[PDB]
Amino acid sequence: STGSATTTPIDSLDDAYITPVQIGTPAQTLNLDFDTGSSDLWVFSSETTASEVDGQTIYTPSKSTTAKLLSGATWSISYGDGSSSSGDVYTDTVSVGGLTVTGQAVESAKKVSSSFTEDSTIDGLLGLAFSTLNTVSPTQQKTFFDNAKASLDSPVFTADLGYHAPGTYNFGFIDTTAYTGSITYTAVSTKQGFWEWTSTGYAVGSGTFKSTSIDGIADTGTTLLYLPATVVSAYWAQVSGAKSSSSVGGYVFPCSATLPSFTFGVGSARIVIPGDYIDFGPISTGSSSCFGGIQSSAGIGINIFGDVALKAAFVVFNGATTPTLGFASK
């Protein structure tokens, strides 16, 4: 089997991407944030505290003839941005782009933190990291990809995120028309539960490539590119007037600037992020200070190849017995 679904930016900045997902019988379609940095499929629901729902579409398990309470199971998750959610668990039929999994754990939110409430466009998350990170207790549950894997034509999914435009998540096949050149594959460590890999270096604009190992995670659920402070300083030093602002929370730059590109290495191959992809717009409405799309990971503990990086590439998440990642230009 295969599936193919379009993923759409939630706003004009590509702050996140939503993909329609069919849950239950009859189908209830929710727009979920596909997140290769976590491993829970959770949704706003009829159980979510009413004051914490503000415009999201909810899953109502009582209206699904295939929903079953997973007795005793609870979940609770906290994300790197400080947001969180928790609740109980149903199993139900879940379909993405024509690919159907029966008995998928659908984690129903009883509580969500303010940033989820405040974002009316995201009805929940669909985790695509390794199932060892799934938070369901006392019986950990598998991701949608893990449950689908054995049925897929090939044990892979691909992320093809758009810049200011829709893109595609495919399951079970590699669309050879969706990228240019060849796909370069690179080793993955699953030891932390992430799609963790080592970039071979970077360049800023037309500058020379610096060969240096940068361990980080391919994370579709993180907006920006978070890299070591040395790398980030070298980037922003090429932008007149750019500075790190403790009060704003990262590097800012004059909105009048033209940003240089940023290149990252994948083995001997190179992925070029155009400068425009690094512009996240005014820090507040009407400001001439703009927020940068490349930020320091120093306070995180891990480097994160988020959407800013991934949207410059066609990315293969290879879930073979030994997982690997593939990157191609497009």
Index terms:
Cathepsin D, subunit A, domain 1; aspartyl protease; Endothiapepsin; 7-stranded mixed sheet; aspartic-type endopeptidase activity; protease; 330 residues; zymogen; 6-stranded mixed β-barrel; mainly beta; 2 domains
What do these coordinates show?
The protein is mainly beta. The protein folds into two domains: 5-174, Acid Proteases (Cathepsin D, subunit A, domain 1), CATH 2.40.70.10; 175-330, Acid Proteases (Cathepsin D, subunit A, domain 1). The protein contains four helices and 24 strands. The chain has helices at 114-117, 144-148, 229-236, 307-310, and strands at 3-9, 17-23, 28-35, 41-43, 68-78, 84-96, 99-112, 124-127, 156-160, 167-171, 184-187, 196-204, 210-218, 225-227, 243-245, 250-254, 262-266, 269-273, 279-282, 289-292, 294-296, 303-305, 314-318, 324-328. A seven-stranded mixed beta sheet has the order 18-17-12-13-22-14-21. Strands 2-3-8-4-7-6 form a six-stranded mixed beta barrel. The protein has a four-stranded antiparallel beta sheet with strand order 15-16-20-19, with no helix packed on it. The longest helix has 8 residues, at 229-236. The radius of gyration is 20 Å and the shape is globular.
